[PDB]
Ligand SMILES: *[C@@H]1O[C@H](CO)[C@@H](O[C@@H]2O[C@H](CO)[C@@H](O)[C@H](O)[C@H]2NC(C)=O)[C@H](O)[C@H]1NC(C)=O
Ligand SMILES: *[C@@H]1O[C@H](CO)[C@@H](O)[C@H](O)[C@H]1NC(C)=O
Ligand SMILES: *[C@@H]1O[C@H](CO)[C@@H](O)[C@H](O)[C@H]1NC(C)=O
């Protein structure tokens with residue numbers, strides 16, 4: 158539907174503790190002020206959108222009922238796909254992987270998908286703002302999250318810790334959601350200057366290609382010019 | 383002559399050595415891939431993962447002599463130290479003249495269309511001569527390889543499509559008017575020469591850059607000395623220094639820490655999960671102050 | 683296995699060259715004269731070692 | 733009246749300039765904090 | 780700052796950390812990776828001194 | 830003019846043109862030949878700046 162405007166999607170890029178440093182690193186990030194697509198069409202039917210994956214995605218739900226819980230990724234989104242069904246009362250729980258032949262997408266109800274056989278892998282793991290901000294990239298889908306309690310964005314800065322890194326190994330050309338106020342964006346290769354605190358946390362960042370100033374800040378490795 | 387000369391450097395030597403590997407599970411699931419009764423075709427090579435296990439590589443030397451054993455980024459006999467942080471293992475059967483193609487940067491019908499290693503590849507390619515088990519007098523046609531594809535493969539991708547490929551210009555359906563099946567069987571026979579005989583290839587793929595690890599370490603651990611210049615080995619990270627109690631607020635996420643110049647300055651103990659700081663052992667230049675040979679042999 | 687940097691039962695337990703070795707390794711096929719139909723049992727290898 | 737017997741102007745001149753190298757017995761700093769980076773902090777061989 | 784930061788560079792080596800090269804590789808390969816690091820370190824020091 | 834002239838030197842490489850090295854050689858050797866050209870060109874810039 159509409160497009161929004163925010164500076165979100167920063168996460169800890171590695172497992173190394175750093176403090177009181179300015180660290181210049183290159184990874185895939187949601188660029189600052191990049192166009193982000195914002196999303197009751199189903200009512201009692203489905204008619205859900207199907208999106209591209211491109212290189213990787215950022216997705217952040219702020220829904221009291223967690224209507225969107227799972228996702229399907231795959232080359233074509235046909236009968237041989239990666240149905241990453243994740244139904245969670247908790248932050249992340251009940252992950253499933255690899256193909257299923259049929260999907261579940263009944264007022265105030267949720268049906269399970271029914272398949273004839275699992276002919277490929279199976280993996281499991283069990284665990285007002287409730288922003289399930291996360292990232293999806295790489296041979297392992299590294300899902301990050303941060304919960305900072307209305308449901309409108311404060312438009313502040315917050316970094317995401319990793320939650321899970323289950324193995325995947327699949328093409329992931331396309332992406333679609335699984336349903337029982339959402340923000341979806343796309344990642345691009347970017348270099349960021351990340352500001353670390355005295356503690357092991359990131360407090361700010363500069364997107365080194367957004368504009369001439371940010372580029373200068375990255376060249377000098379400083380937030381003051 | 384009279385004066386002050388800088389002649390050498392003092393170093394404080396360690397007095398003890400420590401090894402702090404994680405709790406050993408005694409699981410060594412390597413015979414499952416090496417000693418399997420059936421191996422996958424190269425066009426659809428098999429993949430497994432090893433995690434929460436301890437490796438001991440003498441078992442594969444007990445398993446069999448090998449045709450080839452080539453490691454990149456690591457050498458044999460060093461695999462009994464921390465050897466992996468993320469473990470995969472690929473398994474396939476290939477032709478002898480193509481064994482040289484399972485290596486970084488190589489080209490050919492397997493490197494291009496069936497299985498490719500990245501140019502920046504760390505791991506070991508182990509090839510065993512399997513004629514006794516894979517060859518049949520009529521030919522073993524269970525093994526297929528891809529001979530036609532539209533483009534070259536990328537590292538570790540698995541193309542299992544069977545869609546008909548056309549080499550000609552007129553878009554055809556079915557087989558035989560320049561439309562060809564993308565896979566071809568190879569009938570392995572006991573009478574083929576060394577280059578045409580079947581070989582079973584197992585590729586152990588891993589990265590040694592990540593801080594945590596859930597695999598490797600047949601080595602016995604010791605007790606954790608603190609506040610004393612020691613040598614240490616923490617999950618494959620080795621060095622000399624003084625270990626101290628840390629007050630750094632590490633996240634449960636983070637395993638190692640680094641200082642202002644991106645060198646390690648802290649570790650998470652693999653058995654206790656306590657954060658320890660690493661301070662290098664004291665050192666510095668040494669200068670000799672002498673009145674000179676023609677005055678006195680006393681020095682400071 | 684008779685080369686610098688190699689491993690195996692001979693490189694490990696019977697005959698290892700220095701990794702900075704200089705000189706020539708010369709080998710030839712002796713089957714015509716060395717082998718016997720009953721078996722030539724004058725040759726053996728250590729085959730294990732602590 | 734001031735230690736080091738500097739003039740008021742000398743005192744200002746010394747206070748204005750920031751010295752990053754800070755030569756002294758660097759072992760006094762020891763650890764207990766994130767490394768200062770003063771620029772090898774001795775440990776990499778630069779003193 | 781530049782002279783110290785150059786220690787983290789690889790100069791074509793598999794790793795910028797000398798202990799990792801010695802741990803992972805046996806002498807004949809370690810010598811090559813070490814020679815690459817030595818060449819880079821000499822270039823850094825000679826530039827600094829100049 | 831000396832810096833521009835140095836771009837035509839091989840510095841021990843099979844070719845002075847990076848595209849020829851990448852086209853004619855496999856990546857493994859190409860990285861070595863490129864490292865030789867990079868070393869020579871970087872030395873040329875360091876000499877110029879000095
Ligand atoms: C890092 O986290 C610690 C808590 O683990 C913070 O400690 C607080 O420090 C302030 C100022 O000294 C105290 O008033 C608080 O009471 C401390 N909290 C606790 C729980 O002891 C520390 O400030 C954090 N650092 C940063 C930069 O945010
Ligand atoms: C971007 O535009 C939207 C329009 O609604 C606004 O709400 C948002 O605050 C803007 N972002 C910035 C950083 O100005
Ligand atoms: C495992 O290896 C041993 C080696 O002696 C062999 O006898 C056994 O048959 C192998 N396992 C299978 C399932 O073939």
Ligand SMILES: *[C@@H]1O[C@H](CO)[C@@H](O)[C@H](O)[C@H]1NC(C)=O
Nearest residue numbers: 418420421422428429430473
């Ligand atoms: C492939 O690997 C899986 C790992 O779980 C194993 O179960 C399977 O039997 C293997 N198949 C072949 C043909 O090696």
Ligand SMILES: *[C@@H]1O[C@H](CO)[C@@H](O)[C@H](O)[C@H]1NC(C)=O
Nearest residue numbers: 232328329330539540541542
């Ligand atoms: C992955 O999907 C893309 C579709 O964009 C396709 O071009 C590519 O060949 C696929 N690769 C494999 C290994 O399936």
Ligand SMILES: *[C@@H]1O[C@H](CO)[C@@H](O)[C@H](O)[C@H]1NC(C)=O
Nearest residue numbers: 404405406651652653654655
């Ligand atoms: C390892 O085992 C010891 C047994 O006393 C236990 O206390 C410790 O927490 C264990 N550590 C891990 C990481 O499992």
Ligand SMILES: *[C@@H]1O[C@H](CO)[C@@H](O)[C@H](O)[C@H]1NC(C)=O
Nearest residue numbers: 755756757758759760761762
């Ligand atoms: C040397 O160490 C002692 C430890 O008690 C300390 O009191 C003293 O001030 C230190 N001196 C210097 C110059 O570091």
